[PDB]
């Protein structure tokens, strides 16, 4: 199982947020750590992705775009998994030092999205997702959001997406497992979109609410995320 060997070998390990768990749960503190964790996770997603089978076949600009567009979704999906395997979905395991209980969910002002994310987390147990299915599905999410006008070398992208869908079937091998999981993959996107909207709005009014964004995440939020919110860059849904 060569493809899975590789997925297992490149999978990032533990990322802490650096959150001070002695300060009290305030909006500004929680979101400043979330923004920091976001940058720390981007670093790992980049190293991961550059080691993925075939990824370097993409034009370099398309590599960068696909990582930036799909970053939210990748982080949501991996977080749901962590929440499942670590805490059996009771709380949102963003990181070992940044675990969201109900109250934190409220204080972060992201409660509705939080509740969606633990539903997703539950799904992992409900459907009995295997580690190997999680990995292949996570790798697909990288190839699941693109400009409506296409990428710079769109054919290399389509090949790659096609080959990661096939790997997902080589792993499923039933028709019904494919239906459940394409459906699980689709449910990531609406959540990522709400997070995107929330993150964008928060950056615009960040000076007012004392929330702190790392530079690179600010650039990403200001240059790439509006492409998505303005409809130039859309998920590739399986269903509907």
């Amino acid at each position: 199982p060569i493809f899975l060997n590789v997925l297992e070998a490149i999978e990032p390990g533990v990322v802490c947020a650096g959150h001070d768990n002695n300060q009290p749960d305030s909006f500004a503190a929680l979101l400043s750590s979330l923004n920091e964790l976001g940058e720390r996770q981007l670093v790992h997603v980049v190293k991961w992705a550059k080691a993925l089978p075939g990824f370097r076949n993409l034009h370099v600009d398309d590599q960068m775009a696909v990582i930036q567009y799909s970053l939210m979704g990748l982080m949501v999906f991996a977080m749901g998994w962590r929440s499942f395997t670590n805490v059996n979905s009771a709380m949102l395991y963003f990181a070992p030092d940044l675990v969201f209980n109900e109250y934190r969910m409220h204080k972060s002002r992201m409660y509705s999205q939080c509740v969606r994310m633990r539903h997703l987390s539950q799904e992992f147990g409900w459907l009995q997702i295997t580690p190997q299915e999680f990995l292949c599905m996570k790798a697909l999410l990288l190839f699941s959001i693109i400009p409506v006008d296409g990428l710079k070398n769109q054919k290399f992208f389509d090949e790659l997406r096609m080959n990661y869908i096939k790997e997902l079937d080589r792993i499923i091998a039933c028709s019904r497992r494919f239906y459940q999981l394409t459906k699980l993959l689709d449910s990531v996107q609406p959540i990522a979109r709400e997070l995107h909207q929330f993150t964008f709005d928060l950056l615009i009014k960040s000076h007012m609410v004392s929330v702190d964004f790392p530079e690179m995440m600010a650039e990403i939020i200001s240059v790439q995320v509006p492409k998505i919110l303005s409809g130039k860059v859309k998920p590739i849904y399986f269903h509907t």
Binding site: Q63, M64, Q68
Partner: peptide, 8 residues
Amino acid sequence: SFRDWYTS
């Protein structure tokens, strides 16, 4: 800058 860091 994401670009600079990615391709550095």
